[PDB]
mmCIF file of C-alpha atoms in Angstrom:
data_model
loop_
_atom_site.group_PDB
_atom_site.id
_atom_site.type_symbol
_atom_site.label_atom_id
_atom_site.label_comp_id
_atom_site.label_asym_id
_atom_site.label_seq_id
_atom_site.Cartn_x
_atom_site.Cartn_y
_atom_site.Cartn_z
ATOM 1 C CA UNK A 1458 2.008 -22.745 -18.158
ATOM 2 C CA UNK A 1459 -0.622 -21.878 -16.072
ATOM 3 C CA UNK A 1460 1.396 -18.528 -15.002
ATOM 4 C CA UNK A 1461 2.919 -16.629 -17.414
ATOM 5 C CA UNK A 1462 5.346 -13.782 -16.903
ATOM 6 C CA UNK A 1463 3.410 -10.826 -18.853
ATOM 7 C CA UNK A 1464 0.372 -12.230 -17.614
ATOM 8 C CA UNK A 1465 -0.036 -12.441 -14.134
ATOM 9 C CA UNK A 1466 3.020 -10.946 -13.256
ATOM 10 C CA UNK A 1467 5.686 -8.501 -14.932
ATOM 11 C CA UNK A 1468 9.421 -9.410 -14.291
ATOM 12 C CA UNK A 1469 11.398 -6.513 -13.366
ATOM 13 C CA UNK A 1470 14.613 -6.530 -16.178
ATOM 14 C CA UNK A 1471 16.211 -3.946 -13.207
ATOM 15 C CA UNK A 1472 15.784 -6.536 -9.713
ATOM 16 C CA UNK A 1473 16.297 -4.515 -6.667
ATOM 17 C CA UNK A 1474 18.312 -6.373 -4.060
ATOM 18 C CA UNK A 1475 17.285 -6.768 -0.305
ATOM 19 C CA UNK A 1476 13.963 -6.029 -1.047
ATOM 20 C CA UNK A 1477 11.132 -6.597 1.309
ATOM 21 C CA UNK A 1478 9.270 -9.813 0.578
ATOM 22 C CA UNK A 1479 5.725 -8.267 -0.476
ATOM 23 C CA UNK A 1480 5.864 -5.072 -0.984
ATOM 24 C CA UNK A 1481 2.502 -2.974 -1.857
ATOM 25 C CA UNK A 1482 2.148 0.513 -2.658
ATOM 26 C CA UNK A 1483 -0.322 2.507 -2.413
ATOM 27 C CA UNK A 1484 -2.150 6.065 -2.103
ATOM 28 C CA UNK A 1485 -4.943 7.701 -0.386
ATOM 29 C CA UNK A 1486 -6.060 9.397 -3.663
ATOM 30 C CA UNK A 1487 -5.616 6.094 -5.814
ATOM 31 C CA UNK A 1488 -9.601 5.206 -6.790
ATOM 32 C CA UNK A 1489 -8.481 1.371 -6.853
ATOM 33 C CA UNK A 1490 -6.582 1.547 -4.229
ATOM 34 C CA UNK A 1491 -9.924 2.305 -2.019
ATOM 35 C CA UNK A 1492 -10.858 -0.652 -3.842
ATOM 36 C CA UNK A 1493 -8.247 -3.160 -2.638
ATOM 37 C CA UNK A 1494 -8.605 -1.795 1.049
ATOM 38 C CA UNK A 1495 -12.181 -1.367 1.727
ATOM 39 C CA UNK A 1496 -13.997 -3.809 -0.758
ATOM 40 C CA UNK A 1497 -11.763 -6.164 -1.948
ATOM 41 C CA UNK A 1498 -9.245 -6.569 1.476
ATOM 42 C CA UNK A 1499 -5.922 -7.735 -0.851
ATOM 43 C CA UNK A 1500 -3.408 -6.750 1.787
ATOM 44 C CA UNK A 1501 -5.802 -9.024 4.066
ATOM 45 C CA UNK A 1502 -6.247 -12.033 1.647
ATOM 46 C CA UNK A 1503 -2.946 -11.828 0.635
ATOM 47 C CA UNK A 1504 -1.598 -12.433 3.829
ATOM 48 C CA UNK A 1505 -3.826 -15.136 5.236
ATOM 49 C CA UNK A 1506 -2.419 -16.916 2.196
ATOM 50 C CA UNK A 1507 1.567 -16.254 2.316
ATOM 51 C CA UNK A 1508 3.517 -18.901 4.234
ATOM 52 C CA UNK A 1509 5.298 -18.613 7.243
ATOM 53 C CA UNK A 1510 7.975 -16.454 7.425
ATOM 54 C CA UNK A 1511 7.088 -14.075 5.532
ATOM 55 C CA UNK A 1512 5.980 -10.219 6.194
ATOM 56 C CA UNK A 1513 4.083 -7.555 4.169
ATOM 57 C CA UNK A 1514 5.081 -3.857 4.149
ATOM 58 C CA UNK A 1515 2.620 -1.405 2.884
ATOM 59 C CA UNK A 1516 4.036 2.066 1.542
ATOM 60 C CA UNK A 1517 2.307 5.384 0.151
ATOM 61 C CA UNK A 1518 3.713 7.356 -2.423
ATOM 62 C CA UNK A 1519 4.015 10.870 -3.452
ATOM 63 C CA UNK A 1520 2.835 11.271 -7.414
ATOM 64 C CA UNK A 1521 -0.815 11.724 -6.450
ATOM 65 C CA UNK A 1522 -2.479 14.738 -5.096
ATOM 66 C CA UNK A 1523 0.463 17.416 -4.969
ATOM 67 C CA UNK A 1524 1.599 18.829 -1.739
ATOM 68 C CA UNK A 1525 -1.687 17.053 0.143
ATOM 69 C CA UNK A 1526 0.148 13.608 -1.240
ATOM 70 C CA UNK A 1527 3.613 14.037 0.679
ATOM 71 C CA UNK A 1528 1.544 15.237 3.844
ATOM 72 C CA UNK A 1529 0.118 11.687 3.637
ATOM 73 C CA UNK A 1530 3.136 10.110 2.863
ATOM 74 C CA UNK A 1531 5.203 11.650 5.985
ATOM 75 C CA UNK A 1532 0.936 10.602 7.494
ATOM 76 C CA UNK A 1533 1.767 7.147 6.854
ATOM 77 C CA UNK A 1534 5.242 7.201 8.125
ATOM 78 C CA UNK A 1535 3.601 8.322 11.870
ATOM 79 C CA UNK A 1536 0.803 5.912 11.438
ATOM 80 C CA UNK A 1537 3.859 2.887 10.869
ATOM 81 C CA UNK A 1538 6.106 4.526 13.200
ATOM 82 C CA UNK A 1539 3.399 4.428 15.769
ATOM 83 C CA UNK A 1540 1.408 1.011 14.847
ATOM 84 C CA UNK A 1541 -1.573 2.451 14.408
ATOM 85 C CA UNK A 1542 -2.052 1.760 10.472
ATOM 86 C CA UNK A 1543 -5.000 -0.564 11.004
ATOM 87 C CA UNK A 1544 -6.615 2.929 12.882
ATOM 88 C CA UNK A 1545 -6.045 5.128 10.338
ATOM 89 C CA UNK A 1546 -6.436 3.582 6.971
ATOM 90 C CA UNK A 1547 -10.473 3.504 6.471
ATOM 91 C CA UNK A 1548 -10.835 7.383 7.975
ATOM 92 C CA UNK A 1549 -8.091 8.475 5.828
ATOM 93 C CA UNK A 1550 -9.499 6.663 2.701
ATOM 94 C CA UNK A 1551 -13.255 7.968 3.211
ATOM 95 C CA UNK A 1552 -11.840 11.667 3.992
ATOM 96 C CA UNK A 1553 -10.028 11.954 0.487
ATOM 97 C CA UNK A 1554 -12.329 10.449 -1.416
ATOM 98 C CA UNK A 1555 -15.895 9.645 0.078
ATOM 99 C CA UNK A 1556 -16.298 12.692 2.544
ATOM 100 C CA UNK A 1557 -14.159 15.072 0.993
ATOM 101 C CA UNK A 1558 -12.845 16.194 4.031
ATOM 102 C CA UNK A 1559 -9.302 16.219 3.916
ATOM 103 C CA UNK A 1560 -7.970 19.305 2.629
ATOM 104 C CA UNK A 1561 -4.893 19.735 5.146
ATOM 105 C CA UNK A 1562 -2.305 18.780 7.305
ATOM 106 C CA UNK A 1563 -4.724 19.335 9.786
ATOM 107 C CA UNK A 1564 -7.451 17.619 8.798
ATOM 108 C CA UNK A 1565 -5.076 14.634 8.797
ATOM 109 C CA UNK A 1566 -4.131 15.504 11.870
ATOM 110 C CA UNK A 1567 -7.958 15.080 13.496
ATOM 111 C CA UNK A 1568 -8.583 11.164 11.601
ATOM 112 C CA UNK A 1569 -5.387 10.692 14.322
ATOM 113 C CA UNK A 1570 -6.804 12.562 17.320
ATOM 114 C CA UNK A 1571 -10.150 10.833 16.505
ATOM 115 C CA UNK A 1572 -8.898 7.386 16.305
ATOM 116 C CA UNK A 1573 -7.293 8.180 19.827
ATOM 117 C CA UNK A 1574 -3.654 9.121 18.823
ATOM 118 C CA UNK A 1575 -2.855 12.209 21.727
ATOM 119 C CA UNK A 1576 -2.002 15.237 19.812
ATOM 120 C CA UNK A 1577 1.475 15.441 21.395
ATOM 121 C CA UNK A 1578 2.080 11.883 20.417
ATOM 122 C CA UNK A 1579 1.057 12.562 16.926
ATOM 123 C CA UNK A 1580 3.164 15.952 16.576
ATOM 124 C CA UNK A 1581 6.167 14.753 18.451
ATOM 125 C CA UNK A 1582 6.160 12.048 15.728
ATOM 126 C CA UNK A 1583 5.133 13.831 12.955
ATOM 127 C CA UNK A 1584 8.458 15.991 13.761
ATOM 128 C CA UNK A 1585 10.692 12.818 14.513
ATOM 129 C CA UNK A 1586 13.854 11.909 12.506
ATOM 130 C CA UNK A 1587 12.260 8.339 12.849
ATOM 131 C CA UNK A 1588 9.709 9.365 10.639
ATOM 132 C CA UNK A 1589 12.014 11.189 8.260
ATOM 133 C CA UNK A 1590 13.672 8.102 8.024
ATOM 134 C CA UNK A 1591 10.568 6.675 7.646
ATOM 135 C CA UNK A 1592 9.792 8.917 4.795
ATOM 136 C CA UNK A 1593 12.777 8.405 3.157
ATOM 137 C CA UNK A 1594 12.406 4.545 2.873
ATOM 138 C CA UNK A 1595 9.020 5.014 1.254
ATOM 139 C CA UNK A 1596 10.582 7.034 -1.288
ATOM 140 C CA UNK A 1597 13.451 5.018 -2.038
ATOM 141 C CA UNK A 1598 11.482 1.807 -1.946
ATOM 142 C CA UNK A 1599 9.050 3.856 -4.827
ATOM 143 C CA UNK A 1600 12.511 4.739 -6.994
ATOM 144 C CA UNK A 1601 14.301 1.337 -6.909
ATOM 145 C CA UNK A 1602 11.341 -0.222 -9.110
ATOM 146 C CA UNK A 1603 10.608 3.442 -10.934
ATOM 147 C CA UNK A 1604 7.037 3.314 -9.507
ATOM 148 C CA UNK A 1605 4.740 5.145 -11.744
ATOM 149 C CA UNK A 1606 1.462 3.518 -10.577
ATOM 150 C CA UNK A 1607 -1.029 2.764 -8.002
ATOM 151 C CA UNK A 1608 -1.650 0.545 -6.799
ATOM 152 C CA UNK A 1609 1.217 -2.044 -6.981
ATOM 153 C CA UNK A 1610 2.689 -4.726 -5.318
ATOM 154 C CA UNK A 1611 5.828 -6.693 -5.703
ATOM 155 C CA UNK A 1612 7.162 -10.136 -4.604
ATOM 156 C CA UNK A 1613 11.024 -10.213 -3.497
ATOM 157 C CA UNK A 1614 12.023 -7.179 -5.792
ATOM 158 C CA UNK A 1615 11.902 -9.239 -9.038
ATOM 159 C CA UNK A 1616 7.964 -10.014 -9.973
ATOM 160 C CA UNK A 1617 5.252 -7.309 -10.097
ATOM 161 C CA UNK A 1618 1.583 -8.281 -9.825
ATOM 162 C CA UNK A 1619 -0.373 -7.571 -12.947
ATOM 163 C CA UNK A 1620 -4.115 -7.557 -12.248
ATOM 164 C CA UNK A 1621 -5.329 -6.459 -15.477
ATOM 165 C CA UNK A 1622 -4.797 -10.345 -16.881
ATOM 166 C CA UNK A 1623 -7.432 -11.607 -14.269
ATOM 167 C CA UNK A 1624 -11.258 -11.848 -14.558
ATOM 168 C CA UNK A 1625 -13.089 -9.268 -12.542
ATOM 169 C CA UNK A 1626 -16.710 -10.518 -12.762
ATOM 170 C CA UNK A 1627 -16.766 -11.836 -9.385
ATOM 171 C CA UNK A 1628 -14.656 -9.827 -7.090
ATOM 172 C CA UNK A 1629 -14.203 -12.980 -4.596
ATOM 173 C CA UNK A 1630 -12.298 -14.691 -7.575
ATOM 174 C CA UNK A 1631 -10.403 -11.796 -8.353
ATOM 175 C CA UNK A 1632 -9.310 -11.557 -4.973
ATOM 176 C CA UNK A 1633 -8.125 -14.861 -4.674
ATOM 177 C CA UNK A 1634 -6.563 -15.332 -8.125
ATOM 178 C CA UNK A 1635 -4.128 -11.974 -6.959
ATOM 179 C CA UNK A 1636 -3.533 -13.793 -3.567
ATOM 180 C CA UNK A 1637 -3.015 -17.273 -5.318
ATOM 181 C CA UNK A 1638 -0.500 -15.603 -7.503
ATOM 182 C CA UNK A 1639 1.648 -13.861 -4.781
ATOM 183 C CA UNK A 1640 1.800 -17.192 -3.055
ATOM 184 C CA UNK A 1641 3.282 -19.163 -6.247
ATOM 185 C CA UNK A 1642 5.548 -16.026 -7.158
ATOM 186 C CA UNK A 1643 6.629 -16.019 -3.163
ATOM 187 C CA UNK A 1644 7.474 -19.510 -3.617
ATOM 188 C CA UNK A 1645 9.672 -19.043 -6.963
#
């Protein structure tokens, strides 16, 4: 056929039930995941292709960059719990890995204050049990499909993308070929 489990897409043998619809995962230290958010826009293209009904949740994950990687993970949790993802995501990219200027907690904490987030709002969330919980469903998410790579997504906890079987000459056709795919596997 024209797409082939192994080729465009991995079936998971282990399903997860109730899974969200498209699920991505990511990290701030993932080199290709800087990719798919600043140059290539996936989460972006993905969605103005998916049909109605249908939502995207992003997650980050904890295997990359040690102790800085859960700071960015419990990070992500306040920039969901708060809304302010579509703030936070370039600053926090180019500070791990074009500026080099994320070493901390801290220095995490000033991409917020700088993109406007009030440092009490920040650090009252950063301390919530809302983004514990947060936390938590990142992780869990991560361990129902035994996540050992960046970036990923999955459709409906049974089909994983698999971008290595697509031609990446011209990044526009890329881009669409992973879109086109998470529409047909959306509508299996």
């Amino acid at each position: 056929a024209q797409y082939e489990d192994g080729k465009q897409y991995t079936t998971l043998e282990k399903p997860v039930a109730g899974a969200p619809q498209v699920l991505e995962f990511f990290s701030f230290f993932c080199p290709h995941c800087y990719q798919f958010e600043e140059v290539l826009h996936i989460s972006d293209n993905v969605k103005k292709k998916l049909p109605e009904g249908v939502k995207m949740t992003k997650y980050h994950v904890n295997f990359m960059g040690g102790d800085l990687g859960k700071d960015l993970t419990q990070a992500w949790a306040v920039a969901m719990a708060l809304g302010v993802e579509d703030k936070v995501t370039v600053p926090l990219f180019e500070g791990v890995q074009k500026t080099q200027t994320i070493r901390s907690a801290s220095d995490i904490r000033d991409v917020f204050i700088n993109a406007g987030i009030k440092g009490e709002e920040y650090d009252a969330a950063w301390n919530s049990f809302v983004v514990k919980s947060l936390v938590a469903q990142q992780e869990k998410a991560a361990a129902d499909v035994q996540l050992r790579g960046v970036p990923a997504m999955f459709v409906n906890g049974k089909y994983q993308l698999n971008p290595q079987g697509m031609d990446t000459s011209n990044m526009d056709v890329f881009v669409q070929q992973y879109a086109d795919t998470v529409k047909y596997l959306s509508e299996k």
